[PDB]
Amino acid sequence: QCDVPPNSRFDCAPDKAITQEQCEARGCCYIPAKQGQPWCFFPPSYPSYKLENLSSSEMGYTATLTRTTPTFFPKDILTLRLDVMMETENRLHFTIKDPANRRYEVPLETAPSPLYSVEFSEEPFGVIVHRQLDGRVLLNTTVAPLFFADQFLQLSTSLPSQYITGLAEHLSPLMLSTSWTRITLWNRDLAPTPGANLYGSHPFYLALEDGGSAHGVFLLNSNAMDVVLQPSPALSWRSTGGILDVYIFLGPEPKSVVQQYLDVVGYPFMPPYWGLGFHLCRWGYSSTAITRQVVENMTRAHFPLDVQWNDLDYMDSRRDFTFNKDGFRDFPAMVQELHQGGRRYMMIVDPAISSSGPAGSYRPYDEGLRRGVFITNETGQPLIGKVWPGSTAFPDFTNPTALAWWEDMVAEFHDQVPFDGMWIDMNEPSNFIRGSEDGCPNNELENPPYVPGVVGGTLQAATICASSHQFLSTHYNLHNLYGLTEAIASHRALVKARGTRPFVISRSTFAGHGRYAGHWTGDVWSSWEQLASSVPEILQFNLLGVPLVGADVCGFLGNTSEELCVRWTQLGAFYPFMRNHNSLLSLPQEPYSFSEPAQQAMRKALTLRYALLPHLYTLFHQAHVAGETVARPLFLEFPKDSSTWTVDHQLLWGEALLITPVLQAGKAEVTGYFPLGTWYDLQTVPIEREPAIHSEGQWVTLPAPLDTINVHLRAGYIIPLQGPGLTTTESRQQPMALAVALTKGGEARGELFWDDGESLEVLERGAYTQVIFLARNNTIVNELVRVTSEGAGLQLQKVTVLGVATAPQQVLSNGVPVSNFTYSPDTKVLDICVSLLMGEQFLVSWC
Ligand SMILES: *[C@@H]1O[C@H](CO)[C@@H](O[C@@H]2O[C@H](CO)[C@@H](O[C@@H]3O[C@H](CO)[C@@H](O)[C@H](O[C@H]4O[C@H](CO)[C@@H](O)[C@H](O)[C@@H]4O)[C@@H]3O)[C@H](O)[C@H]2NC(C)=O)[C@H](O)[C@H]1NC(C)=O
Ligand SMILES: *[C@@H]1O[C@H](CO)[C@@H](O[C@@H]2O[C@H](CO)[C@@H](O[C@@H]3O[C@H](CO)[C@@H](O)[C@H](O)[C@@H]3O)[C@H](O)[C@H]2NC(C)=O)[C@H](O)[C@H]1NC(C)=O
Ligand SMILES: *[C@@H]1O[C@H](CO[C@@H]2O[C@@H](C)[C@@H](O)[C@@H](O)[C@@H]2O)[C@@H](O[C@@H]2O[C@H](CO)[C@@H](O)[C@H](O)[C@H]2NC(C)=O)[C@H](O)[C@H]1NC(C)=O
Ligand SMILES: *[C@@H]1O[C@H](CO[C@@H]2O[C@@H](C)[C@@H](O)[C@@H](O)[C@@H]2O)[C@@H](O[C@@H]2O[C@H](CO)[C@@H](O)[C@H](O)[C@H]2NC(C)=O)[C@H](O)[C@H]1NC(C)=O
Ligand SMILES: *[C@@H]1O[C@H](CO)[C@@H](O[C@@H]2O[C@H](CO)[C@@H](O)[C@H](O)[C@H]2NC(C)=O)[C@H](O)[C@H]1NC(C)=O
Ligand SMILES: C[Si](C)(C)CC[C@]1(CO)NC[C@H](O)[C@@H](O)[C@@H]1O
Ligand SMILES: [Cl-]
Ligand SMILES: [Cl-]
Ligand SMILES: [Cl-]
């Protein structure tokens, strides 16, 4: 009965420190570890639920689950309903609910044979999901008891391997440790550090299977939760409320798992083109005059800058929807001038609204009070916390009236200052005091029978009371959606205020956030450790459908070094969202504030990113239309090479661009993994050391002096490029170029998506140009998928072909010898001058 292998023991005392006698009285096994592993664990006979009256339906199964012996938690739900829905060949969906009471549910919009088969264990109850093709057991919930109590759900499963990623937001390797790891999902304001619940919660994992197939599991549950991983290997979901709403995504390819997950939670939003340019911010740009000098200093030193930002500086006494009449007296003129120069403007918005101002003197509060927009306490009055302005009320973004109020406050402020998006901070929501000015009542929501592993050991720590009232439910159920609901509110407000694509960057997130907004990783230290950690974290958010993600380039807290800021700018130029942001008390870290050689390296990083923008924009189009990742781990692109599985200090842009950054001080080289194939050094492509790495799938040491970041182009791919500019307003008017990386057999393929860069409903209206590029048998051609006014008249002026073994005797464009070409025998690069249009069929040939 108690003869269970150490790694397969599930904790029978997750709630408290227990003695042997108490453990044995619960009906559990007490065996101390020999040095973590639970001492008190479930025998195989521990009372679970029994399956009864299993019945078949069109599109699935239903059953009753019955528990006859109570658990050690209060309020077991003794009778449950199981619903199994076989939704698509790729997507299995099951719920476990209380048939006698509607419980809290997360608000979410909804040869021939499935990839899965499903079976059930009768007693103890379990759901068993096989991969049909190879019989692999993906889900087996029979491994531990089902707990289903009012404030405690636990469902466990075997894992198919030791390789599992997901369960944001935490500072972790991309692949999570199965060594008795407790991962806590409770949105929390805390500087990224390992083992802590951070700003967001994504209850989704992708699990790798031997051979390179994968599946995903989504628990649609927004309650405070722990996820416990153990080395058997196995996983336990432990939630403090709601229901069990489980999706299984059968892949079989890791890229298909992510797409299938995003079919449920939403495809990433399409950002404006300008959103992919460089962003520059700090706390301490304390006047329009200082803020204007940033743009002047960047422009003087030839550094691209699309978007100037301000932090709290612009506000009147740190209040939303105000600007002070000292340093920011001419705020509106500053933003209009930025626009005249072809730049955009972003500023910080906090959720909490100053509640202490004289009545009638501060419209956001006064109108919020009138319309009942705020989270309320026991007596129906606004819950009052403390944030930057002092005493504050907290908008309830589940209240439709709050959405209307937020739209009005954003539109009215935009009529004063035409800002181009919203930086939504502190939306955990973050509170400077515990719960409220008035503390919190003593009830089961504030003091629940199971408290997950949250920093501070309470649901109230750094946030508002758990028993506070929102339109849809208590904050207890809704806390992990606070940031997401604000992001939805802000997305709609910006659409109504500006009539073009919204640009929202949010601190706090939940599953499906990417449908509305991007994310930055928060208060990272200016350290080599946090630079290195930003790579796994940016990859993790791409797997979770938030591709518009980055870290504060050169780090946020503390003082950067020139060397760290060179390496951080080099790597950060490959963040899909690229912003340099800096704390109030920090030494300056704008590119122009460093030595001449450091400026050259930073300018080169920005030049290359701007040259690549048409490509990065096309990668976002694929994310938006097909649920693809933008920045992706090697294992997503080469899952059948098991050597890629633990690589998280390299990243790809899409299928073709491999980035191998230096992430350590004092290094003049970097060792990176190169999947099987040829990888061309991007340094061999002209933009305004081995030329090719021929890998069998192996580790390769690369020269990486201070002025270099290693970037390689995969053979068989074509990348569109565009000429330079200090803004995308300038760069989008330049001639374009192609970089063509030939296979040994002379083949390559690539594409370009182009639209006006900011309109709504572009794909629905067909207001875009889509072109495919094909290299074959010493020819390059375009294939016109769609050609419209927007994209017709893009000029192709340069074609660079990599892996051309022999100097050609002649190079033809549309049957005429070209004006000019060069061939380099040492690099195998053929550089061709042309006068072609992306939107008009061409043929470039050489021999
Ligand atoms: C729900 O939220 C509301 C706010 O929307 C919150 O109202 C607050 O209630 C407390 C009382 O519990 C108020 O505090 C009082 O403030 C007045 C005037 O500003 C003071 O003079 C009062 O002093 C008396 O009580 C003291 C206790 O420390 C005594 O020592 C003293 O001698 C006085 O007898 C007292 O501090 C507070 O003003 C309001 N806040 C606002 C914004 O009106 C309400 O309490 C919340 N409900 C729950 C159950 O949490
Ligand atoms: C899903 O997980 C469940 C529970 O872990 C697995 O069922 C368990 O399987 C073990 C090993 O197969 C069983 O122990 C064996 O019992 C047989 C029958 O008497 C005996 O001959 C063996 O020597 C051993 O004792 C165990 O009874 C069983 N547990 C339960 C609760 O049924 C199951 O195999 C997993 N399913 C799949 C498809 O992987
Ligand atoms: C399992 O189901 C049986 C039978 O339920 C009946 O048939 C079902 C398809 C459905 O249409 C029900 O409405 C029917 O009642 C349950 O046993 C019945 O229990 C009811 C209510 O107590 C009683 O009136 C009948 O005499 C029982 N019928 C038989 C054949 O035993 C049983 O309770 C269900 N089990 C659980 C755990 O819910
Ligand atoms: C970040 O650095 C500031 C400033 O450091 C000083 O000024 C720089 C130009 C450089 O020359 C440094 O070596 C200098 O020491 C730190 O703020 C200073 O902190 C000290 C000690 O706490 C204080 O006594 C000084 O007056 C501060 N000076 C200024 C000009 O603000 C700050 O502590 C650094 N942050 C961290 C986390 O180390
Ligand atoms: C923009 O650059 C200007 C010129 O370098 C900076 O102004 C100088 O700042 C130094 C401090 O390092 C002062 O000693 C000088 O008096 C200033 N020089 C001039 C020419 O005025 C300015 O600080 C930079 N501003 C920002 C916002 O980065
Ligand atoms: C940690 Si602080 C320097 C006291 C506070 C910083 C700020 C101030 O708005 N709020 C939190 C955000 O994460 C920061 O990016 C932001 O600059
Ligand atoms: Cl008004
Ligand atoms: Cl509810
Ligand atoms: Cl290896």
PDB file of N, CA and C and ligand atoms in Angstrom, residues 363 408-409 412-413 415, ligand 7:
ATOM      1  N   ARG A 363     -11.757  64.960 -12.921  1.00  0.00           N
ATOM      2  CA  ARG A 363     -12.854  64.317 -13.688  1.00  0.00           C
ATOM      3  C   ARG A 363     -12.730  62.791 -13.660  1.00  0.00           C
ATOM      4  N   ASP A 408     -13.843  57.148 -22.648  1.00  0.00           N
ATOM      5  CA  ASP A 408     -14.060  58.621 -22.568  1.00  0.00           C
ATOM      6  C   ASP A 408     -12.791  59.306 -22.028  1.00  0.00           C
ATOM      7  N   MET A 409     -12.194  58.788 -20.950  1.00  0.00           N
ATOM      8  CA  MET A 409     -10.995  59.424 -20.320  1.00  0.00           C
ATOM      9  C   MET A 409      -9.825  59.400 -21.318  1.00  0.00           C
ATOM     10  N   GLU A 412     -10.737  61.864 -24.326  1.00  0.00           N
ATOM     11  CA  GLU A 412     -10.650  63.294 -23.901  1.00  0.00           C
ATOM     12  C   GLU A 412      -9.177  63.687 -23.726  1.00  0.00           C
ATOM     13  N   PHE A 413      -8.359  62.835 -23.102  1.00  0.00           N
ATOM     14  CA  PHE A 413      -6.923  63.145 -22.907  1.00  0.00           C
ATOM     15  C   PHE A 413      -6.250  63.208 -24.281  1.00  0.00           C
ATOM     16  N   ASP A 415      -7.581  64.192 -27.078  1.00  0.00           N
ATOM     17  CA  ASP A 415      -7.973  65.507 -27.663  1.00  0.00           C
ATOM     18  C   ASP A 415      -7.028  66.609 -27.177  1.00  0.00           C
TER      19      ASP A 415
HETATM   20 CL    CL B   7     -14.527  67.133 -21.424  1.00  0.00          CL
END
